[PDB]
Amino acid sequence: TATLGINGFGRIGRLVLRACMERNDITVVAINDPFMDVEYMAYLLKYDSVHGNFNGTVEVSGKDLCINGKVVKVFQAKDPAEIPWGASGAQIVCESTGVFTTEEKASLHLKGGAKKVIISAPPKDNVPMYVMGVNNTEYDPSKFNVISNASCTTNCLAPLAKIINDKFGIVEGLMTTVHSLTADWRAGRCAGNNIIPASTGAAKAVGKVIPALNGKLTGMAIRVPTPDVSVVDLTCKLAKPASIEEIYQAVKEASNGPMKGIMGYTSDDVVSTDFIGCKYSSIFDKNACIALNDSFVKLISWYDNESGYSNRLVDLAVYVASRGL
Amino acid sequence: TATLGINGFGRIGRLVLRACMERNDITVVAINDPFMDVEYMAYLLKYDSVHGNFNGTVEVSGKDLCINGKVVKVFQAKDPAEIPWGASGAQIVCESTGVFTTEEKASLHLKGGAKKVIISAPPKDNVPMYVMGVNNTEYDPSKFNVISNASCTTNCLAPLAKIINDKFGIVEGLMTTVHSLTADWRAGRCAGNNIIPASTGAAKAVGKVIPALNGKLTGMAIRVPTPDVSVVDLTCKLAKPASIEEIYQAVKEASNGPMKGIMGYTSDDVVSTDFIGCKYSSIFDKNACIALNDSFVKLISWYDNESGYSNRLVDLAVYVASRGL
Amino acid sequence: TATLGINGFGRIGRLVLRACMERNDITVVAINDPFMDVEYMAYLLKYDSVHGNFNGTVEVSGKDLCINGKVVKVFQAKDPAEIPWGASGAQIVCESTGVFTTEEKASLHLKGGAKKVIISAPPKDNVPMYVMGVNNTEYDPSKFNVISNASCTTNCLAPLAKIINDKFGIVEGLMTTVHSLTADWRAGRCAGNNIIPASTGAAKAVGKVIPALNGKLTGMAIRVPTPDVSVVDLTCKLAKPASIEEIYQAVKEASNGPMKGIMGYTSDDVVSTDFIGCKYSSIFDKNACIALNDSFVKLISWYDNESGYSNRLVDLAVYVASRGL
Amino acid sequence: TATLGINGFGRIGRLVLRACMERNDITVVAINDPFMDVEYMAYLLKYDSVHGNFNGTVEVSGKDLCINGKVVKVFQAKDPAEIPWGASGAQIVCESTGVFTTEEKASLHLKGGAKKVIISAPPKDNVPMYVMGVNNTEYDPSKFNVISNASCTTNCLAPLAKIINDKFGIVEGLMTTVHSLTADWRAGRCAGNNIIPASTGAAKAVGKVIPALNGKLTGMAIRVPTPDVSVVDLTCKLAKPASIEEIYQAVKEASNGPMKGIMGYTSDDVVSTDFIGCKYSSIFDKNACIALNDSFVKLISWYDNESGYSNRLVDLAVYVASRGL
């Protein structure tokens, strides 16, 4: 059974733990964050404005945490190499501080006894990025000790882009993602009452996760005042004509097939809040989609930027473990 | 000087009046709304959560209103044919109830003495739509007594699409407009905390205002919880190659020339709120635009869905009067 | 098991139904609402922007609904006397349209075969009000067939006031309740952008539920843009001096005793969202309470204005049934 | 004409500059912020999500700014002791970084050539606090070089409390101020989605600004998701009986005479947004006030926590200058 260590007890780190506590194939054994006291960590785990109260009990034991009775070690080393991951028994480390997004820095965890490291964000260098259901099987334990689970936006676009490209072929595509606040001068403006244009490298990252799409996609983001749940607006030109119904069918096939639990779909009159807590990486909104003609369409896909991503990072760890440490 | 009568004292109707009070070439002489008491009309004109306090003085005079010293006649006739527009000295009627959107219904104002009617929305029938700066000069006074000022979304897309189509040619385009709340099962969901997919006929409406674009554009909308100001996200393929810089220069030219006051532009890192009160119909956001290549681009254009549209209606009323009643 | 009939399938009626589905001592057998098709009712029950997806299954069956394998009859009669409550086997009717708040109108449900009626709001007439945990045992089945569950605000203030008045005696009190949007010219102003002063008859209602406090309290409300969960701010002069600690202990005793499931308490650094879904009628916030001295204090108590109230109405229905229908 | 220097170009600092630019009795000469380039400063000054575009022109001239044809030296020292105020000619400094709130830290601005310093926040040490219209004349230029302009909340409560105490006498009072987001573990929770209990020392601070009220007032705050404008809810016991109408008259008298421009009043059905941009320190809402009896009342007063406070700081600067530098 895989054991996890979390560095950076932020939104992501906290959600990863919550996702583990609900699973029987992965256990969180230790957490590290030099900027959080044990009591504060407990408080932050027990209450959340988006995901509700923690499903279980959280208490402080000495210097550590006792979650649902299980003990979770709590460290505060500003240097990855000094985090007793090994003594803690943590085999895989979830690097979610957003400060060690390079093999160089992230690999320091191995010096702490860790066998593998997953950066919860795209890397600054060439660390391989993996998107569950899209290219995770390309991972080779005998070649990589530090990998990346890309970003929340990339995890929404990649699976949809892959299904579409595989079936009809994407000649070119432009994406706009409408981001909730949990998903540059503009960025500093009041988030509560503004629609804010922003940058996202998701479209390009998809080009890396899916080589065939390199140079064929690019996009931007638009931040809106909602707390959680985002949407991908992908308008692309198809190499082979196709209707929304056929696109819908191809997505349904993948969703019920090779991408079970990763790609989802709906034909209901849903809105943002209906996906809070949804574990899917990408949910196709059939009725929201529109097409000018059989080769120029606009696809809409939902994603709980927090839940989907966090659960994918856990799926990735579990998968890594399954490949042998 | 042109005189105006307003039917329906809602958000648009009130803003049209506030726009007129600023101008010396048109005056509001009568308002008709069978569902609002004058005291309440006074209240709604004096205070606004988006546009601030009314600039001036508003007082009830008997059953009428006294605005900045001028007597504005108030009526409550449910039948447009029975509104005394003629006796009141109102030449042009701003039909903004949203209930009389066909030539048959709107023309009833003419029986009340009005000489011309402008529907503050797209027609359900074939009433001609005019967009200032785009096709308003096609208006023929000897042929139409009832016209339409289209919609806020069309007034944003039309001028931008015209420019792009005139200089580079639009092969095909797909639009997404992020709508503020002042701009169906989904529509009824909580607006305050949801991103809500929605429909708009603006892309097709542009296909009539600009016949050349007929069949080459389509789109949808996405509603978010901001009080005012929306954005048009146009992704299109050009017939001739063009860089963002050249597209910017084209808009800049039109903006400083044939579309002054209508098409605008910026290269600053603006956000939603920066356009509150802006009178332009469409503002190109240079830095927000992105290009995949020289023939496939995504253009971003802001518009205060309330202020721009309301000022265009006044401009159209003034233009109508200049052509002879 | 008592059976419930629901008139008016709005926010309250829907949550009352979702609460019943969580219990075995009460069953919903029918719903009446002339302004909703069966399809729409299903959608509204399945999806919700505050309480999440319906915990279970919902399908349309002919003209009725099948909820978790159970048949719930659907009617659309505008006259309460025309609703076949009796024929549907519904014993108690939850009157939640907000339009039949008098015995005269509410009793019309009895003509349909219903035995008891509970108005989900304070009555416009002398219909008796009952607050679970405060005065519900005063209910006399031989004297009333129509009763009221008061209001969400009253259900939060009554239990707290009773405890304080009994233990220390309330000399006089002034209340301010901060209302979420689910809880007059100002009332019609932009909700998600304003702090809006408003009215509430809670204080006076409490003087009727607890006679001894009649004329000793009065309050007002302040509406804010949060979706759900409200707060009661009670500032009062006590007959007998007391510290916040003593007041807390007092509330604690009641909460663990005679007011179990009704009065709650906490000493954690909670915020609004931590109470979404909480079923208590009132939750004392120890750390938010402050005192100028031992006989002049300000008490802060939370309440999910939707969940607490709806569950109290179900509790009252169960109770009423236990007393002889 | 006094000269002002601004340290910390945040919301307050900027609004303080915008206020100075509208007056002829004071001139902004320099700005310092170790975290902003001159370009970023110009941007933050020209655009604002709450107060609209800058009223005038903003241009970067070398390393400095040219605001409305006037030169404004720009610095970026992280230490007050190293800011060259003298050179620029800055006589009085507006210390608005929120970090140097002690005489020890704040007095360093003098080393730079600055004669007087006004902290835009309640001090941590014994630096004197002044509220224009209440106790600013107590200022002694021969004994203070570093003073405080109190807080936004204190500037709302003090004037009201002074009027009420002078006329009827306040025996005891408890305050709750509903704070907009621009006005502890809870503090860190998502602001745009929660009602958050908070602390404020405003009530106790009033006891120092008005010694007679020492020990007679205390209060708390409740933060809500509105962009700007807050409210003071003062529940107090009076020494002499008084009706809401009489209290209103006393406020009116103070407002039209001795406290003009500071204390204001209204009897309209106002809401939050109606006060955006209001320069008053406190606005009595007549129709929102309520009373249990002639000696126990709840007073409601509004305040633009940004505009009022900022203009008061500028008033205080001009006043400090009149007293001889």
Residue numbers in the entry:
A (entry chain A), B (entry chain B), C (entry chain C), D (entry chain D): 2 to 184, 198 to 339
Text from the published report:
In the apoenzyme this loop, which forms part of the NAD binding pocket, is not visible in the electron density map apparently due to disorder in the absence of NAD. In CpGAPDH apoenzyme the distance between the corresponding atoms ranged between 4.55 and 4.93Å in different subunits. Comparison of the structures of apoenzyme and holoenzyme reveals, in addition to ordering of the S-loop, four other regions differ significantly: residues 35–36, 77–83, 98–103 and 180–184. In the absence of substrate (or analogue) or anion in the active site, the side chain of R249 points to D210. As a result there is no sulfate or phosphate ion in any of the CpGAPDH structures.
